[PDB]
Amino acid sequence: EDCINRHNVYINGITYTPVSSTNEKDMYSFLEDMGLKAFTNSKIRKPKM
Amino acid sequence: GKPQYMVLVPSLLHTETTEKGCVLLSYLNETVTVSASLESVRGNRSLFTDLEAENDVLHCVAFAVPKSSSNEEVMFLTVQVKGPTQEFKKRTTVMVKNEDSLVFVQTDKSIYKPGQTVKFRVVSMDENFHPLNELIPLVYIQDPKGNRIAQWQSFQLEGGLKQFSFPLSSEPFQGSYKVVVQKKSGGRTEHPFTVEEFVLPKFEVQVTVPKIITILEEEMNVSVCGLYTYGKPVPGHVTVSICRKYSDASDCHGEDSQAFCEKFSGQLNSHGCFYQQVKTKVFQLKRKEYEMKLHTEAQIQEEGTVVELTGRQSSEITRTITKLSFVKVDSHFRQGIPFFGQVRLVDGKGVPIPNKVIFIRGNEANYYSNATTDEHGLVQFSINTTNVMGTSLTVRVNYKDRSPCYGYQWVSEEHEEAHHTAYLVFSPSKSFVHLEPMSHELPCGHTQTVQAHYILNGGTLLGLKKLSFYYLIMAKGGIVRTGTHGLLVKQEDMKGHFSISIPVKSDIAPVARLLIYAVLPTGDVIGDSAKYDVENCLANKVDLSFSPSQSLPASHAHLRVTAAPQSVCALRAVDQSVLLMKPDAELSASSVYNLLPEKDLTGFPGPLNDQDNEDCINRHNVYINGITYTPVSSTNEKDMYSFLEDMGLKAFTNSKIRKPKMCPTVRKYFPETWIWDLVVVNSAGVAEVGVTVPDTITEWKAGAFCLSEDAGLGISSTASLR
Amino acid sequence: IYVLDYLNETQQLTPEIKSKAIGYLNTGYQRQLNYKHYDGSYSTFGERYGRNQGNTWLTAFVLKTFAQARAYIFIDEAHITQALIWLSQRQKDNGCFRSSGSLLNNAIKGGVEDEVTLSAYITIALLEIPLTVTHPVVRNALFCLESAWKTAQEGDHGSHVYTKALLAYAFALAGNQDKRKEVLKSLNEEAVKKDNSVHWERPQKPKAPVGHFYEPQAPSAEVEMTSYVLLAYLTAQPAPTSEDLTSATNIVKWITKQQNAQGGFSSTQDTVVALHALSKYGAATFTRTGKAAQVTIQSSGTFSSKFQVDNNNRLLLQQVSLPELPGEYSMKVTGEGCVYLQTS
Amino acid sequence: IYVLDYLNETQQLTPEIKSKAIGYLNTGYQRQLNYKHYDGSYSTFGERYGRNQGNTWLTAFVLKTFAQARAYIFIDEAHITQALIWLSQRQKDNGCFR
Amino acid sequence: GRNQGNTWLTAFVLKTFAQARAYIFIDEAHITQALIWLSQRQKDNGCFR
Numbered sequence A: 001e002d003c004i005n006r007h008n009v010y011i012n013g014i015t016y017t018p019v020s021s022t023n024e025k026d027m028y029s030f031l032e033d034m035g036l037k038a039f040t041n042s043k044i045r046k047p048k049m
Numbered sequence B: 001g002k003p004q005y006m007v008l009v010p011s012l013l014h015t016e017t018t019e020k021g022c023v024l025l026s027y028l029n030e031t032v033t034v035s036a037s038l039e040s041v042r043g044n045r046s047l048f049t050d051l052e053a054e055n056d057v058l059h060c061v062a063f064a065v066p067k068s069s070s071n072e073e074v075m076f077l078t079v080q081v082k083g084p085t086q087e088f089k090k091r092t093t094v095m096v097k098n099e100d101s102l103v104f105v106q107t108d109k110s111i112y113k114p115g116q117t118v119k120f121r122v123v124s125m126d127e128n129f130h131p132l133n134e135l136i137p138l139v140y141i142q143d144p145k146g147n148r149i150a151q152w153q154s155f156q157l158e159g160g161l162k163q164f165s166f167p168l169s170s171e172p173f174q175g176s177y178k179v180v181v182q183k184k185s186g187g188r189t190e191h192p193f194t195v196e197e198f199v200l201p202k203f204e205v206q207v208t209v210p211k212i213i214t215i216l217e218e219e220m221n222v223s224v225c226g227l228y229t230y231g232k233p234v235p236g237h238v239t240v241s242i243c244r245k246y247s248d249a250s251d252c253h254g255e256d257s258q259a260f261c262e263k264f265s266g267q268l269n270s271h272g273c274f275y276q277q278v279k280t281k282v283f284q285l286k287r288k289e290y291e292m293k294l295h296t297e298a299q300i301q302e303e304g305t306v307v308e309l310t311g312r313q314s315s316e317i318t319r320t321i322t323k324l325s326f327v328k329v330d331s332h333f334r335q336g337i338p339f340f341g342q343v344r345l346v347d348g349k350g351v352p353i354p355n356k357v358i359f360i361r362g363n364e365a366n367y368y369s370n371a372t373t374d375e376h377g378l379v380q381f382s383i384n385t386t387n388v389m390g391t392s393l394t395v396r397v398n399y400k401d402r403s404p405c406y407g408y409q410w411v412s413e414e415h416e417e418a419h420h421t422a423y424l425v426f427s428p429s430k431s432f433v434h435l436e437p438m439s440h441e442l443p444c445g446h447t448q449t450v451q452a453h454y455i456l457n458g459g460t461l462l463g464l465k466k467l468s469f470y471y472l473i474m475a476k477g478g479i480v481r482t483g484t485h486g487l488l489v490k491q492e493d494m495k496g497h498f499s500i501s502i503p504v505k506s507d508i509a510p511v512a513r514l515l516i517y518a519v520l521p522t523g524d525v526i527g528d529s530a531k532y533d534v535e536n537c538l539a540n541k542v543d544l545s546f547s548p549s550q551s552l553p554a555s556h557a558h559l560r561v562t563a564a565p566q567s568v569c570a571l572r573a574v575d576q577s578v579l580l581m582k583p584d585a586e587l588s589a590s591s592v593y594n595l596l597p598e599k600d601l602t603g604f605p606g607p608l609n610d611q612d613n614e615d616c617i618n619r620h621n622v623y624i625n626g627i628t629y630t631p632v633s634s635t636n637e638k639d640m641y642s643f644l645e646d647m648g649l650k651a652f653t654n655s656k657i658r659k660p661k662m663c664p665t666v667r668k669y670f671p672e673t674w675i676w677d678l679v680v681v682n683s684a685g686v687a688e689v690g691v692t693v694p695d696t697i698t699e700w701k702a703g704a705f706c707l708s709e710d711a712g713l714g715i716s717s718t719a720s721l722r
Numbered sequence C: 001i002y003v004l005d006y007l008n009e010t011q012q013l014t015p016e017i018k019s020k021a022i023g024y025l026n027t028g029y030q031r032q033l034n035y036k037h038y039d040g041s042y043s044t045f046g047e048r049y050g051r052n053q054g055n056t057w058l059t060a061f062v063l064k065t066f067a068q069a070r071a072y073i074f075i076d077e078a079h080i081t082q083a084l085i086w087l088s089q090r091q092k093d094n095g096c097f098r099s100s101g102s103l104l105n106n107a108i109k110g111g112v113e114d115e116v117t118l119s120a121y122i123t124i125a126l127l128e129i130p131l132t133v134t135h136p137v138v139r140n141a142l143f144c145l146e147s148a149w150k151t152a153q154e155g156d157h158g159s160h161v162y163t164k165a166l167l168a169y170a171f172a173l174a175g176n177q178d179k180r181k182e183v184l185k186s187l188n189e190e191a192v193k194k195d196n197s198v199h200w201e202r203p204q205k206p207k208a209p210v211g212h213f214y215e216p217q218a219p220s221a222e223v224e225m226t227s228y229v230l231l232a233y234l235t236a237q238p239a240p241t242s243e244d245l246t247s248a249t250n251i252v253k254w255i256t257k258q259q260n261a262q263g264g265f266s267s268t269q270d271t272v273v274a275l276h277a278l279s280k281y282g283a284a285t286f287t288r289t290g291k292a293a294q295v296t297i298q299s300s301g302t303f304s305s306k307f308q309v310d311n312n313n314r315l316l317l318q319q320v321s322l323p324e325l326p327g328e329y330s331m332k333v334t335g336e337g338c339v340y341l342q343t344s
Numbered sequence D: 001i002y003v004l005d006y007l008n009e010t011q012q013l014t015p016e017i018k019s020k021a022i023g024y025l026n027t028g029y030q031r032q033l034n035y036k037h038y039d040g041s042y043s044t045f046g047e048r049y050g051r052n053q054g055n056t057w058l059t060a061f062v063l064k065t066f067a068q069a070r071a072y073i074f075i076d077e078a079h080i081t082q083a084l085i086w087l088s089q090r091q092k093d094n095g096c097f098r
Numbered sequence E: 001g002r003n004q005g006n007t008w009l010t011a012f013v014l015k016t017f018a019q020a021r022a023y024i025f026i027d028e029a030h031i032t033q034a035l036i037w038l039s040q041r042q043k044d045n046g047c048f049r
């Protein structure tokens, strides 16, 4: 679904840094680990799509 | 109020030349002593110059550097701030170099006839253009076969010059010769002249052809005349021709690109010329057809004299046709001040065309806005600053899209666009100083004033009203002038415009790199830098005033020369027939400025010198917690070091300048050269009483130059006598 | 280089080997030069499509051996000055040098990757290149090296004892005769004597200092250590005292015994300094012209024994007894060349 | 080699060029040695695959220039003797060399 | 497999696998598999992405 990781490639700070994925625990992951899906409005999933 | 110290020095320090370097001891914590020490990479060679520093004053100091046997040697320069409380020091590599003098040779003539004595004079000056009594080891005349025919060894120039003479043989080699001067360093300054048998011409062949002509053309106007003295024309049966060379494919036994051309014929009118228009349709000037040559043949009547003149063979049929270009646009913008940029329209013979629509494009802030060319084909505009770093700005006009069949294939006639990519500066405390750009040839002997805009929104921090702004101007690879300005601010004071004066003196050579910068107690530096093209001028103002205008084979003619109060001036007067024959080798102000080494210093001496590592904080963080962690690479953001690097001077400092990323009587005779001589000017000018020449069938064109210890050298405007 | 150097000082040398050596020497120099960066640096790989960044230990190492190399075979001085300059660009007043060591394999050195141990190597290598103590890079390095001693001198927990050994030769080589003996007294006290043979070592099987770095380099620490300290003992500016060299001779007895069966030593950076330390001792001890060396050992009570040591004898353990119950003996040496007298 | 040789006999020479030269000289020697056969020969292809047979003019050429080169820098005498020997193996009394 | 199927190519395949299915018999799973993937890249507003 809507890929927001490939949206940004350039980024500020003191130096520019090109994108690469993350291995963390998002709310979605817990609901997935539970084995149930969720229809929602609020922020539940990590952006990396 | 966190203190700071700063010292600026050029990255290329000329040995045996007074090289200026400035110091800024900014905060009043105590009385301190600054001291730069230059020393060798290997060996015990060592120096020290103590610099007398005062608090919040930009005190300057110069110094001559000792000679090195190696043409270019790299050495260690370390500055040291010694004080009871704080003791700071920093090192970098600098390159020393023995930049030799700029010398030249003037010859009595461009061409010689055999048996005729050649007279030349050699002269030497420094980067500051003033007579330099150098010791030249060698000067010699090389014939066309390459044999050195005459030479003058180890000699010193008395008034920054020396005149010479070589008698040519009765049976010399017909061709081109050249006098050469090998300096002590080796730097061979060459200068030619031809030798051949010839009958001088009495009359010129004035050919008039459009300097440049449009590809889309039906016909064109062209004319040819013939005069000699006081503009008295001569009648003759002219036979002009107008041809072209498609692709200089080198003959192939069928003419060197001798491609189709309409020749012409006619008689010249007295009190006039022969005029003609020619249809260009015959030439086609399309399908890999490049340029044109225009021969003449004013076969002078009442004589059997056929003097041709292959004049104006620079009549171009350029590939471009509809064009535009920038004029005054900033290359440095900031997210907190909408940038401004001017553009101009040009086509064919640089014709500016008003009242025609343009199409600006900005892939960033989406400034896709049209406008129309005002009088003198021009459009100024500004855009809103709210996006990423690199901002690309292109400007398209009239018809960008069109169908010229294929791109490469058989013929292209592109209509060039104009484009630019400005980058932002790294703002430390959201504060910045912008310099209003005025790129255009600045006239010397006329002061200019530059506008400076300042943003200090919480840039004060300490909140003290008094804030010092400093500026420096550079040229010829060294700092020339220095100054300051004291802007007295509020606690927060972001809006304001203020300008600084600048006299265009001429000690600033063609390049004029100007910087400005602030010194905040937050330990930050904010500034800007810009380049201004200066017109090529001499300091010794001289003018040749030939007094008895025209005359006739007379005696005593008053020829005057105004110059510096005390100066040696080399005069040269010759028949404008030998000058008509082969034009003398260009000797103007522009000729001398090109002779100068280090016309501009931009960037450190990169091939020799390199250094960009003193704090690898780049790889400390392998990544940073973005909404999804991402690893680092590199950057192109502009900062302060970059402006000092672009200037070509490095800086020893304590405050934040570089971005932390530091890891990646019904008788006739005697005509050739009338007067080859020199004179000394009294306090004003000097009048030379030259006895007039008798075979004065033509005008006598004559020029000169001067040397003064104070006002450098000068060059006269070639004054004639009819 | 150091084998050619050692073979020459011992006097045992052959021209059929000198020639066979120079061939492997001149070739390796030119092959090494093939991995030099535009800035004068050197990298493990070379210059693989311009992407490679410099390792400050290999450059410094190259320079120390291009300083040595330069004595037998001719080296282009530009390569050393080019390197020296690049080393100064990686030089911070505080902490002397920066660790830019990007490599794959670390058996190549003995340094603890520490700014102290790295600067401690660059400072020897720089001093070893004949450079004055008044030089600006050595001025900002020596100052860092005094601060590194007074910080490592606070206690037993002071970067352990490896760092401590390099600080000796560096000082000795620099000329702080006073600070040299100050670090040398606290190392001599921290030494481990044995059967007439002294040495230096880390904690045998650690147990207490735990937290491994890649793999164990301890067999190479102990070899390098002693030989670094032997150089510090031999390196006195006027000349080493009889008290310096007699203590140095004991260190020699250990290293010479502790040798790799096939030839050389455990690592490589420990084989290099062993041979350099041996040859530098060998220069001080041996003599070329004064072949005669007479010795006389008598007693208060009519005892008399004397020997002639020289090029035909040195390779031989000349022994004598005659046991008189209350010893009152006088050892008298004459002529030239040294003799070691061990009484048991 | 022959430029270094000529510059020296004319007397017009510089140490900043002698050094710049020796670098391109010692490198090229070692790079050329990389195409030497086990038998002392030299082929345009070199060792690669181990199926190449010595170029009779290339070997002789190498030797003529390794004789010269040997004066300015230091080329291992074994390489010349190795070559000389292989040149003799392809030497027929009649018709001298093939 | 370093790719993400293009929405037009998939849709095209499906339109022609619908047609194709009339003369030559096709595996219905391939169409349903595609149809499902097309629904995953469907936003209420702006229909398809």
Ligand SMILES: *[C@@H]1O[C@H](CO)[C@@H](O[C@@H]2O[C@H](CO)[C@@H](O[C@@H]3O[C@H](CO[C@H]4O[C@H](CO)[C@@H](O)[C@H](O)[C@@H]4O)[C@@H](O)[C@H](O)[C@@H]3O)[C@H](O)[C@H]2NC(C)=O)[C@H](O)[C@H]1NC(C)=O
Pocket: C005, C008, C009, C071, C288
């Ligand atoms: C390698 O083996 C070489 C022999 O194959 C050794 O060469 C010998 O080197 C010594 C000196 O290094 C020469 O001795 C002579 O010494 C006198 C006086 O000494 C002066 O120089 C020393 C420093 O060297 C200094 O301390 C004194 O104050 C003196 O100023 C000179 O007058 C002579 O000219 C000469 O140099 C031997 O002649 C020389 N050859 C032989 C055959 O012994 C070399 O030392 C060994 N080491 C290395 C690293 O190469």
Ligand SMILES: *[C@@H]1O[C@H](CO)[C@@H](O[C@@H]2O[C@H](CO)[C@@H](O[C@@H]3O[C@H](CO[C@H]4O[C@H](CO)[C@@H](O)[C@H](O)[C@@H]4O)[C@@H](O)[C@H](O)[C@@H]3O)[C@H](O)[C@H]2NC(C)=O)[C@H](O)[C@H]1NC(C)=O
Pocket: D008, D009, D010, D011
């Ligand atoms: C070419 O390269 C050389 C090496 O790079 C340059 O240096 C020269 O090096 C050689 C030694 O390798 C010097 O040799 C000279 O030998 C003579 C010996 O006497 C002979 O000549 C005299 C007459 O002059 C004659 O009477 C005798 O019978 C001998 O046959 C000595 O007298 C010299 O002092 C010197 O040692 C070269 O002379 C030296 N060059 C110079 C200019 O010193 C060399 O310069 C390069 N170019 C040339 C032209 O050789």
Ligand SMILES: *[C@@H]1O[C@H](CO)[C@@H](O[C@@H]2O[C@H](CO)[C@@H](O)[C@H](O)[C@H]2NC(C)=O)[C@H](O)[C@H]1NC(C)=O
Pocket: B001, B002, B003, B029, B085, B086
């Ligand atoms: C003026 O000098 C004093 C010392 O006389 C400076 O004090 C130092 O400040 C830094 C932090 O900025 C401390 O880490 C140091 O320990 C301080 N002492 C010394 C002796 O350096 C002070 O920075 C200066 N400026 C002001 C406005 O006080």
Ligand SMILES: *[C@@H]1O[C@H](CO)[C@@H](O[C@@H]2O[C@H](CO)[C@@H](O)[C@H](O)[C@H]2NC(C)=O)[C@H](O)[C@H]1NC(C)=O
Pocket: B357, B369, B370, B371
């Ligand atoms: C240049 O830009 C202006 C404003 O963006 C355009 O102006 C409009 O033009 C139409 C007719 O083409 C008018 O009906 C409107 O009144 C104009 N104003 C606005 C704000 O829309 C203009 O068309 C552009 N020029 C060209 C050549 O397209």
Ligand SMILES: *[C@@H]1O[C@H](CO)[C@@H](O)[C@H](O)[C@H]1NC(C)=O
Pocket: B044, B045, B046, B047
């Ligand atoms: C460095 O030492 C030498 C002695 O070898 C001396 O002659 C020279 O003058 C010294 N240099 C300076 C600048 O003091």
Ligand SMILES: *[C@@H]1O[C@H](CO)[C@@H](O)[C@H](O)[C@H]1NC(C)=O
Pocket: B221
């Ligand atoms: C060319 O000649 C025509 C003659 O009518 C004239 O109108 C035109 O101005 C001429 N071109 C120029 C550049 O003067």
Ligand SMILES: *[C@@H]1O[C@H](CO)[C@@H](O)[C@H](O)[C@H]1NC(C)=O
Pocket: B338, B382, B383, B384, B385, B386
């Ligand atoms: C940007 O500045 C321009 C000034 O011409 C103004 O017209 C525009 O409304 C501004 N827009 C924003 C987003 O600030």
